Amino acid sequence: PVRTPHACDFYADGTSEAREFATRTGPVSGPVLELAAGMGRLTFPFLDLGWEVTALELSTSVLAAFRKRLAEAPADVRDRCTLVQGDMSAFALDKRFGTVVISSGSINELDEADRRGLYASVREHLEPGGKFLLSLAMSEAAESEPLERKQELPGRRYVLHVRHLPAEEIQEITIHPADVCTHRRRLLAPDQVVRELVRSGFDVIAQTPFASGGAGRKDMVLVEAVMP
Amino acid sequence: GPVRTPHADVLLASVGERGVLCDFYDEGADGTSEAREFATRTVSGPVLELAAGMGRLTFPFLDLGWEVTALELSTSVLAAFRKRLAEAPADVRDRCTLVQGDMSAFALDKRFGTVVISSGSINELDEADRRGLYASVREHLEPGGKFLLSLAMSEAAESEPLERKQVLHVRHLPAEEIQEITIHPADETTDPFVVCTHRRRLLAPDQVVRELVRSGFDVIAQTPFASGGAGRKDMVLVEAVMPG
Ligand SMILES: C[S@@+](CC[C@H](N)C(=O)[O-])C[C@H]1O[C@@H](n2cnc3c(N)ncnc32)[C@H](O)[C@@H]1O
Numbered sequence: 001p002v003r004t005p006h007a008c009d010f011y012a013d014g015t016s017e018a019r020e021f022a023t024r025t026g027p028v029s030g031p032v033l034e035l036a037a038g039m040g041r042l043t044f045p046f047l048d049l050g051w052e053v054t055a056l057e058l059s060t061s062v063l064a065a066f067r068k069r070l071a072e073a074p075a076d077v078r079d080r081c082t083l084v085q086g087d088m089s090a091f092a093l094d095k096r097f098g099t100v101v102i103s104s105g106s107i108n109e110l111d112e113a114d115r116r117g118l119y120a121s122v123r124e125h126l127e128p129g130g131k132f133l134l135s136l137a138m139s140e141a142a143e144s145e146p147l148e149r150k151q152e153l154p155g156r157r158y159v160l161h162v163r164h165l166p167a168e169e170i171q172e173i174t175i176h177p178a179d180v181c182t183h184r185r186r187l188l189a190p191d192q193v194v195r196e197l198v199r200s201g202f203d204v205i206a207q208t209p210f211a212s213g214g215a216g217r218k219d220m221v222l223v224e225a226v227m228p
Numbered sequence: 229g230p231v232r233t234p235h236a237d238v239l240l241a242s243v244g245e246r247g248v249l250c251d252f253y254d255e256g257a258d259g260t261s262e263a264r265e266f267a268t269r270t271v272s273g274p275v276l277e278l279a280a281g282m283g284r285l286t287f288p289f290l291d292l293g294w295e296v297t298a299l300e301l302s303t304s305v306l307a308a309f310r311k312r313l314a315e316a317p318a319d320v321r322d323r324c325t326l327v328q329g330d331m332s333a334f335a336l337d338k339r340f341g342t343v344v345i346s347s348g349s350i351n352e353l354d355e356a357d358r359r360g361l362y363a364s365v366r367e368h369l370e371p372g373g374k375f376l377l378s379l380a381m382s383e384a385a386e387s388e389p390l391e392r393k394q395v396l397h398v399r400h401l402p403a404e405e406i407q408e409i410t411i412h413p414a415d416e417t418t419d420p421f422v423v424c425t426h427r428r429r430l431l432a433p434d435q436v437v438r439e440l441v442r443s444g445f446d447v448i449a450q451t452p453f454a455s456g457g458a459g460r461k462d463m464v465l466v467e468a469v470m471p472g
């Protein structure tokens with residue numbers, strides 16, 4: 001239990017986010033691997049686009065919920081979805097895919113070392129010319145231009161320029177009855193993940209901001225990465 | 229090779245053939261006050277200083293009478309320290325113990341009443357290596373001994389995080405930034421116009437504090453201070469102890 005300065009813990013439809021993934025993939029022949037699929041907040045929208053989806057999830061309990069939802073769906077929908085228990089930071093399906101997909105909530109679950117395991121696992125499950133697509137929440141600090149500081153320093157005079165670039169923040173939530181719950185989660189800057197992707201061998205061909213809920217301020221980025 | 233910053237991009241473009249871009253840390257043509265912050269918040273006996281470098285802090289510490297063990301990873305840096313230590317008075321020279329080691333995974337046949345590390349040093353370490361540091365420090369602290377850290381504090385790290393309510397309170401807390409610098413001569417001509425760039429890790433002081441608590445320390449004080457004695461307080465002095 002985290003006792004924030006404002007003192008119980010604390011522990012949305014995926015159609016728009018899913019359509020954004022579909023925009024940045026285009027033709028997609030063959031199956032799509034979705035990492036940390038949860039109970040299908042994105043997977044069901046993906047299936048509705050006609051995609052064949054291998055949905056990977058770590059939790060037994062979450063898998064049961066997903067399986068139940070799938071039993072409730074029409075046969076043609078359920079038939080296009082393959083559920084697999086695994087760890088997105090270290091998995092082996094002995095099988096490659098034209099497209100690999102991961103959501104922001106998912107990637108922000110992993111620390112730095114685990115993200116490297118993720119990147120490497122993905123490399124092993126991409127077919128040549130395959131696409132690795134990520135969505136990433138973008139905070140106010142992450143989208144803003146960094147304030148550059150300038151100082152004149154001395155014999156020879158130099159000008160020093162200093163900027164601080166966003167890398168990682170904590171999203172803190174205190175739930176509050178109006179007349180008290182708690183959560184802190186990781187919030188990586190899209191630019192930080194892009195740096196990490198390049199470092200792990202990927203070329204990042206595009207970063208498209210979008211609105212998670214499909215309207216209003218653009219609060220997310222869709223990153224397309226490919227293997228050279 | 230070197231980091232190509234937006235301001236560097238435009239400089240080099242508008243300078244042509246005279247322009248040279250290199251990282252700040254290669255071909256490249258403070259201390260006593262940060263040292264005093266440490267001295268102010270501390271001795272019964274020997275101090276351990278981690279990642280001592282060439283002794284920007286260590287020599288100030290030695291001038292206070294301290295027995296210092298200075299741990300450093302780089303062999304050439306240690307050689308350079310040793311050279312500076314050779315020109316030092318015999319009494320200063322005898323109170324200094326130089327040791328080669330990794331501050332993320334080190335083991336000495338000694339414990340200490342005080343262990344110190346500066347901002348530049350802890351920011352060299354990724355998250356995993358920082359956990360290795362905290363565990364190692366705990367093992368080298370005598371009962372009641374203190375772990376003292378100095379931590380650079382950016383403007384975003386210094387500000388009160390912006391809230392947005394709906395009631396649902398949402399704050400975004402700084403955890404880690406990248407400090408990016410660009411340095412060039414104030415003129416334009418010069419003969420060779422060299423532009424230095426560098427990118428480095430810059431942890432939020434509160435993030436390191438969260439990590440220390442998680443690691444088993446009690447953080448008993450955090451005092452902001454100015455790295456050049458005066459001006460904006462751009463640094464925090466953290467004191468941590470083991471509970472018991
Ligand atoms: C914030 S949710 C995102 C789920 C979904 N893609 C969405 O957009 O709603 C993170 C999910 O990843 C799962 N998860 C956490 N770590 C995992 C791991 N290492 N491998 C696979 N799944 C993981 C959790 O069980 C949880 O269901």
Ligand SMILES: C[S@@+](CC[C@H](N)C(=O)[O-])C[C@H]1O[C@@H](n2cnc3c(N)ncnc32)[C@H](O)[C@@H]1O
Pocket residue numbers: 278279280281282283284285299300301302305329330331332345346347348349352
């Ligand atoms: C920013 S300087 C700090 C030096 C000194 N404490 C000061 O305030 O001037 C970083 C120093 O840490 C050393 N270093 C880097 N990683 C290290 C490690 N894992 N263990 C010990 N020293 C390390 C480098 O060789 C360098 O001397």
